[PDB]
Design an enzyme around this catalytic site. Structure first.
Site, mmCIF file in Angstrom:
data_model
loop_
_atom_site.group_PDB
_atom_site.id
_atom_site.type_symbol
_atom_site.label_atom_id
_atom_site.label_comp_id
_atom_site.label_asym_id
_atom_site.label_seq_id
_atom_site.Cartn_x
_atom_site.Cartn_y
_atom_site.Cartn_z
ATOM 1 N N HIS B 41 35.277 31.786 -13.493
ATOM 2 C CA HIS B 41 33.820 31.798 -13.777
ATOM 3 C C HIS B 41 33.293 32.399 -15.010
ATOM 4 O O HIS B 41 32.228 32.257 -15.445
ATOM 5 C CB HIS B 41 32.995 31.823 -12.589
ATOM 6 C CG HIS B 41 32.628 33.090 -11.979
ATOM 7 N ND1 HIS B 41 31.704 33.921 -12.618
ATOM 8 C CD2 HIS B 41 33.094 33.615 -10.954
ATOM 9 C CE1 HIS B 41 31.609 34.954 -11.644
ATOM 10 N NE2 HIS B 41 32.307 34.890 -10.650
ATOM 11 N N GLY B 143 27.181 41.617 -11.675
ATOM 12 C CA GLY B 143 28.105 42.244 -12.431
ATOM 13 C C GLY B 143 29.444 42.878 -11.947
ATOM 14 O O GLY B 143 30.331 43.423 -12.513
ATOM 15 N N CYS B 145 31.633 40.976 -9.984
ATOM 16 C CA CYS B 145 32.680 40.159 -9.991
ATOM 17 C C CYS B 145 34.014 40.547 -10.698
ATOM 18 O O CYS B 145 33.891 41.304 -11.732
ATOM 19 C CB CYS B 145 32.354 38.752 -10.639
ATOM 20 S SG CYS B 145 30.912 37.816 -9.678
#
Ligand SMILES: N#CC1(CS(=O)(=O)N2Cc3ccc(Cl)cc3[C@H](C(=O)Nc3cncc4ccccc34)C2)CCC1
Ligand SMILES: N#CC1(CS(=O)(=O)N2Cc3ccc(Cl)cc3[C@H](C(=O)Nc3cncc4ccccc34)C2)CCC1
Ligand SMILES: [Cl-]
EC number: 3.4.19.12
Lengths: 297, 305
Positions: B41, B143, B145
Site C-alpha cells: 500500500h 507511520g 506500517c
C-alpha cells in the site's frame, strides 16, 4: 491506538554484553570502551579478597572472543576490569542515577548472551519487580535519550519475596541493601501516584472515559486520601509534570485526582482501564507522551 | 523468580529497518540481503485505498520512484516485484547487518516481539500475541506500517508479521513476510471488522502453571474434569476450545509441577466461576493469555518453588 508496556530498542546495549568468570562464579559484564563493569560479588572484605586476585584470574568473553584483562579496581559495589581492547560497538553513553517512580528497560542476560528485554520501574521501596533467574547478575537497566544510552541499573540480587535489588553503574545500591548473603527484606511498598495519573491520561487519549467525573479536589484532600491506600504523596512538581497531558485532554490534574479517589474508594465495578483490572503505576508521564507521539532512536 | 511480559532483544532487527518513500507516502521497510520488504500500500494514495488495483498502480512505477533510506544513506532500487500484499524492492547493496533469518507464518495464540518504527527508526519493543480473531492488540500510530513481528529462538530471527493497518476498534491487522494476511482482512479501506475475540485457553493454562512454578497455589482445587465438560464451560466465557494437541503441549509443565492438565482445567473452571476475590496471580487481577507454553518454559525456572 493501543497502549503497551514498551521497552527501548536494546541493540546499543546488546553490543556491550560480555561474560565474566572468576573461579566458580559466572555472571554478565558491561563492556564500554576498554573497561568491563560487573558486580563485585563475582570475586566479605572485598578489598582483601581482590588483592589476592590477579588479572588472569578474571576470564572475560565477548561472543566467541576472549578479552585480556590488564587491570582491575573497585568502585563501591562494582568491579571495573581494564581490558586490552576497546569495544568497537561502544555507543554514546552516560551513567545516571534514577529516582523511585522512574522507569527503565532491562536487558536480561545469561552467560554474556541477551535473552530478553522488558520495561520496569524503580519501586518507592527501591526494589524492582523483575524477571531474573541465577546467572542474571550484571544484567543492566537503561533509557535512551536521542542516540545516547543512559545506564541506570546493574542487577546484583534477589530478595526472599522474589523482587530484585541492584546498583547504579557507579556501584551505589538503590535501597538499604548490601551485596552479601544475610537477612534483608524489601520495605513495605507504595503505589507511584504520578504514574497512575499518567496512565489514566493515556486511557483517556485511547478513548476510555468511563471513570471521568464532574468533580475536582484540593491537593491536600487528595493526599489525605492517597496516604490511606498506600499511595505515594502527590507533589506540586508532579502536578506541573502532568500539565501537558492535562492540556491535551482538557482534564485538570486535580479533576483526574478526584477520578482516582473514586476508583480507590469504589473499585472498578467489573470494568477495566486499558485492559487492566488494577491501577497501573509503571508508566511515567514522559513514557505516556513518548508512546502517544512516536519518538524514535 | 518473577514473571514479566518479555520481548526478544531487538538489535538483530534494528539493523534491518529502513524508510520507504513513494510520492507523498512514507513507511518502514525490512532490508534483508539485497531486498527491502514493505507493505504494497506504499504505492497508494488515500483515494486509491477504497478499491486499489495494485497491479495497475505498480506497472506505472519505475525503480527510481521508490526512495529507500538506510540511516543517512540512500539505497539505489534496481528492481521491484509484488508478492501477495508485500512489495519487494531489489536494492544495489546487501545489508551487512543481515542476521541469520527465516520467514515463518504463525497460528493464533502464538506470541512474538514487535519493533515499532516510524520513518525507518525504531522507537520501541513490546511483546504481543496473534489473537484467535487474527488481529493483534498493538500500539501503533500512523507511520508505523512496515514495523515487524519476530521471535529469536537461538541466534536466528524468525520474521512472522509485518504491520499493514489499524481496524476501527483500535486493533491491528497485517501479513506474514510472504504478503499473506492473517485473517479475512484486505489492504483496502473497505468496511471490515475483527470477528468477536476469544481468550487463548492453552496460554491461560500455561500462565497458571507459571504461577505454580513461582510458588502460588491458592487457585488450585481437589477436582478434575473431562476435556468435553471443560470445553462446554469455557465456551460460555468466550474461551477458545482446548484440543488434545493443547493438552499434549502442556504435558511437560504438568510433569514439572505435578498437576495433571485436566486438574489445572478444573482450577480454571473455578476461577471463571468465582473471579479472584481481591487476589492476584503473578501480579495480575485478570487471567493472562499472552504467554504460550513455550514462553513459560523459556522464562521460568526448571525447579518449582
Ligand atoms: N535470597 C535469595 C536467593 C538468592 S541466593 O541466596 O542464591 N544468592 C545469594 C546472594 C547474596 C548476595 C548477592 Cl549481592 C547476590 C546473591 C545471589 C543472588 O541473589 N542471585 C540472583 C539474582 N537474581 C535472581 C536470582 C534467582 C534465583 C537465584 C539467585 C538469583 C545468590 C535464594 C532465593 C533467591
Ligand atoms: N481505520 C482506521 C485508521 C487508519 S487510516 O484510515 O488512517 N488508514 C486507512 C488504511 C486502510 C488500509 C490499509 Cl492496508 C492501511 C491504512 C492506513 C492505516 O491503517 N494506518 C495505520 C496503521 N497502524 C496504526 C495507525 C494508527 C493511526 C492511524 C493510522 C494507522 C491508513 C484511522 C484510525 C485508524
Ligand atoms: Cl505458530
Amino acid at each position: 491506538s493501543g497502549f503497551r508496556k514498551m521497552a527501548f530498542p536494546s541493540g546499543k546495549v546488546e553490543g556491550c554484553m560480555v561474560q565474566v568468570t572468576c573461579g566458580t562464579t559466572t555472571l554478565n559484564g558491561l563492556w564500554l570502551d576498554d573497561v568491563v563493569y560487573c558486580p563485585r560479588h563475582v570475586i566479605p572484605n572485598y578489598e582483601d579478597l581482590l588483592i589476592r586476585k590477579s588479572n588472569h584470574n578474571f576470564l572475560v568473553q565477548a561472543g566467541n572472543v576472549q578479552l585480556r584483562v590488564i587491570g582491575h579496581s573497585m568502585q563501591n559495589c562494582v568491579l571495573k576490569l581494564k581490558v586490552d581492547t576497546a569495544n568497537p560497538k561502544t555507543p554514546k553513553y552516560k551513567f545516571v542515577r534514577i529516582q523511585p517512580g522512574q522507569t527503565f528497560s532491562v536487558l536480561a542476560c545469561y552467560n554474556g548472551s541477551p535473552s530478553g528485554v522488558y520495561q520496569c520501574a524503580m519501586r518507592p521501596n527501591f526494589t524492582i519487580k523483575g524477571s531474573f533467574l541465577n546467572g542474571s547478575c550484571g544484567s543492566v537497566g537503561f533509557n535512551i535519550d536521542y542516540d545516547c544510552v543512559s545506564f541506570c541499573y546493574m542487577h546484583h540480587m534477589e530478595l526472599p519475596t522474589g523482587v530484585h535489588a541492584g546498583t547504579d553503574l557507579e556501584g551505589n545500591f538503590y535501597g538499604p541493601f548490601v551485596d552479601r548473603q544475610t537477612a534483608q527484606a524489601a520495605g513495605t511498598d507504595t503505589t507511584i501516584t504520578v504514574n497512575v495519573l499518567a496512565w489514566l491520561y493515556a486511557a483517556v487519549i485511547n478513548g476510555d472515559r468511563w471513570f471521568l467525573n464532574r468533580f475536582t479536589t484540593t491537593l491536600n484532600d487528595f493526599n489525605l486520601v492517597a496516604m490511606k491506600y498506600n499511595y505515594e504523596p502527590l507533589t506540586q512538581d508532579h502536578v506541573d509534570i502532568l500539565g501537558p497531558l492535562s492540556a491535551q485532554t482538557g482534564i485538570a490534574v486535580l479533576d483526574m485526582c478526584a477520578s482516582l479517589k473514586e476508583l480507590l474508594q469504589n473499585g472498578m465495578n467489573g470494568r477495566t482501564i486499558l485492559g487492566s483490572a488494577l491501577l497501573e503505576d509503571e508508566f511515567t508521564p514522559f513514557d505516556v507522551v513518548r508512546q502517544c507521539s512516536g519518538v524514535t532512536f
